[PDB]
């Protein structure tokens, strides 16, 4: 009966958790790896604007904070 659907899920979940334990630190890399792409693409997004709006420098008092890498 419908348990037979749940069994599949139950297994697929278990078999996933196990995986994410072994793979943990590999995972941890690739997460942060993409956060450093994010923050960069983000930056370029704004850089694009100065250069598109004709300004040479980034406007006064702009440090362009890091949102994605926010921790603690």
């Amino acid at each position: 009966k419908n348990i037979l659907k749940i069994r599949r899920r139950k297994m697929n979940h278990h078999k996933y958790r196990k995986l994410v334990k072994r793979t943990r630190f590999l995972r941890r890399k690739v997460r942060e790896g993409r956060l450093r792409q994010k923050q960069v693409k983000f930056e370029r997004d704004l850089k694009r604007i100065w250069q598109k709006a004709g300004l040479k420098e980034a406007p006064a008092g702009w440090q362009t904070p890091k949102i994605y890498l926010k921790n603690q």
Partner: protein, 175 residues
């Protein structure tokens, strides 16, 4: 803040005959002094509906309900001050602040002058519901902040580059 004075003689006893001759003990018993809080809220209700309204009798009047609701809100706010952890009553307050806004939108569509005067009296302000409810998140708030400042700059630069042209062409026209 208003203050329904300690001696105010609970509402249901206000208009009955032969009160003031009565001795100070019983007066003390029927005072707001010995009252529940519900009583004080009946009073606040009365006073507010006298100051604000036209026809004290109409309950169904859109105005009336706005005033009454406002009284109860003001109460939920004090109860909110003293209990900050109480989620239930936070819910009531925030539903109610809203419903009041609903009926205010009704006044503003239907009878304008009246709506106006109520907003004046009860210190309620009507802020039109802004289109597009979107959760502003860090990425967006930041990119907008930047853009706003880029604008604020390019209009400055345009201003100066045209200002030196004003100065140059005027200094050539003068001599």
């Amino acid at each position: 803040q208003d203050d329904p004075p300690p001696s105010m003689l609970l509402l249901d006893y206000q208009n009955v005959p032969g009160i003031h001759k009565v001795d100070d003990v019983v007066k003390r018993l029927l005072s707001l002094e010995m009252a529940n809080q519900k009583e004080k809220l009946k009073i606040k209700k009365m006073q507010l509906m006298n100051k604000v309204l036209e026809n004290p009798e109409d309950t169904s009047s859109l105005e009336a309900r706005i005033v009454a609701l406002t009284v109860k809100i003001r109460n939920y706010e004090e109860h909110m001050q003293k209990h900050r952890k109480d989620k239930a009553h936070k819910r009531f307050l925030l539903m109610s602040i809203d419903q009041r806004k609903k009926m205010l939108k009704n006044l503003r569509e239907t009878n304008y002058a009246v709506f106006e005067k109520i907003c004046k009296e009860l210190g309620i302000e009507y802020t039109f519901p802004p289109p597009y409810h979107r959760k502003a998140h860090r990425r967006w708030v930041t990119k907008k902040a930047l853009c706003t400042q880029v604008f604020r700059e390019v209009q400055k630069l345009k201003k100066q580059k045209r200002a030196l042209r004003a100065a140059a062409v005027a200094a050539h026209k003068q001599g």
